[PDB]
Symmetry: C2
């Protein structure tokens, strides 16, 4: 992508910062981010000539004005937490549905060429029909999952009502540089890496045979950019279509870190589904083929990032 003027909501966050990095040399980029979880220092160059940063909540921003003469909108801003949403459903509704809708209204009023929306495999709930096809019904188990599904439904309705073109991307388990490790809720790869680097035993919730479809953050960024350039409108899973158990993950991370620190086993967390696996056939719709044998290399890059932060 070259010579476009794009908006990246949540562009100071984990995933959004990697999208900004990939676009910024050849495109004007306006980030809208309230710093609720993102950081200026997540950007490779936060002073880049092509960059604009608007430090504001989407609910307050004049999105009708900001989106004038923009080409594409990448919507990553969200309160991105399943357990957080259970504790605070109304606040999550404001950030995840209401703000998204305000953005989508400004998109259609400004004739934005495409919206690329960050959804989640959480919308599937506990579905045994793996590998999970996009045609599965929604089975949201948390307010967060209902919110992402609601946004997908609004996008469908905006396509029909106003001709707004969009891709909704259902991410599976994203990992990589700049992912949070500090929250009680933080993802397993950051927790395993952080624990080992701090000389502490990590923990597994359950027996460790649970499995996930992990996908590297730079691949998510590529999928976003390819979706913007595609003529396809609709919903696409973004993953590798491969399973890894948490036991196996721990072995691999321990090998990468040359670590003899052992893992502890605790009871299962309520709400954790046992197995999650994407069907990624529809990645053909955006001409995306993720790298299928680069997990160790990606983990090494992630570890090096966490080392640099100590």
């Amino acid at each position: 992508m070259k010579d476009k003027n794009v908006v990246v909501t949540g562009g100071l966050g984990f995933i959004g910062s990697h999208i900004v990095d990939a676009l910024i040399d050849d495109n004007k980029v306006t980030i809208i981010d309230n710093l609720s979880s993102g950081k200026m220092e997540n950007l490779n160059n936060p002073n880049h000539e092509n960059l604009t940063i608007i430090k504001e909540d989407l609910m307050d921003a004049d999105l009708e004005k900001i989106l004038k003469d923009k080409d594409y909108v990448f919507h990553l801003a969200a309160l991105a937490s399943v357990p957080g949403s259970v504790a605070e459903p109304l606040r999550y509704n404001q950030n995840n549905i209401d703000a998204s809708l305000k953005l989508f209204i400004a998109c259609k009023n400004n004739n934005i060429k495409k919206v690329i929306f960050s959804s989640s495999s959480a919308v599937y709930g506990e579905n045994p029909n793996m590998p999970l096809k996009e045609s599965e019904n929604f089975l949201p188990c948390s307010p967060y999952a209902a919110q992402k599904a609601s946004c997908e439904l609004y996008l469908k309705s905006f396509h029909e009502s106003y001709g707004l073109d969009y891709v909704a991307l259902r991410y599976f388990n994203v990992f990589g540089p700049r992912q949070d490790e500090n929250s009680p809720y933080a993802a397993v790869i950051p927790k395993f890496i952080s624990a080992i680097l701090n000389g502490e035993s990590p923990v597994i919730y359950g027996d460790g045979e649970q499995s996930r479809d992990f996908i590297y953050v730079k691949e998510i960024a590529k999928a976003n950019i390819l979706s913007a350039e595609s003529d396809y409108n609709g919903v696409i899973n973004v993953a590798l279509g491969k399973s890894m158990t948490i036991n196996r993950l721990f072995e691999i991370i321990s090998d990468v870190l040359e670590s003899d620190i052992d893992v502890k086993y605790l009871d299962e967390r309520p709400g954790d589904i046992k197995h999650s696996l994407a069907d990624i056939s529809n990645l053909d719709k955006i001409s995306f083929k993720p790298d299928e044998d680069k997990f160790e290399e990606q983990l090494r890059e992630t570890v090096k990032w966490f080392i640099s932060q100590m």
Copy 2:
């Protein structure tokens, strides 16, 4: 249902007033209604000893307090318009998602035994797989349809997260006494009846071969009450599972009114789907069998109501 204390949101409206009528002799009923479209005079007895009316927007009401010690909540309050939602998606979002969520939060915090939610066959969009089963995916064509679907998804998530029991009822084409005829958007049965009573030719948008699954408002009220009493949680179509063309409807209404006024034919309305038909198998889940040969009787009751309003 006897000796319960219930809340009916939108209880001064078309459908809600019939639910209030059916419950009020044997139960305490609190209506919450902002009079945006409902009327005091829709109730059979607006001064009934068991009645309380709170004239307030759901967004402003202290629902946490109002729902203390209530048994059931019937949620009918909404901005109930497909074309209105296209014109004003944010305002419709506030009334249809945000207010519903505030209510559902108060329901789960007060351990309400059941929520009975008014959804719509609009959530199916233009789906040729008739008769339409509840398992069909959502295909919302308007912000309204997305909003009703979002509410259904929130209810599912609240069942999983908090144990809130619910039934979402997908109404097909409701008709009967107290339905609005004055809006530009008003439903076909009121428009046909009102036109003929005013000595004016009604209009058909298209060729009249379009068909709908019409369902009488008193049957909707019964389905609501049976759903409250049922152990079932989930989503159920409420209809007859029968089709009637708009041409045939006009013939029947003209016969009932002994009218020689002819109908005019105009171009199709954008957004109108041609055929809509419910699969009503899952009405067995709430032990409801609607009357299958009472259409003329129901139309006569509707006509007599419109006559009484002249």
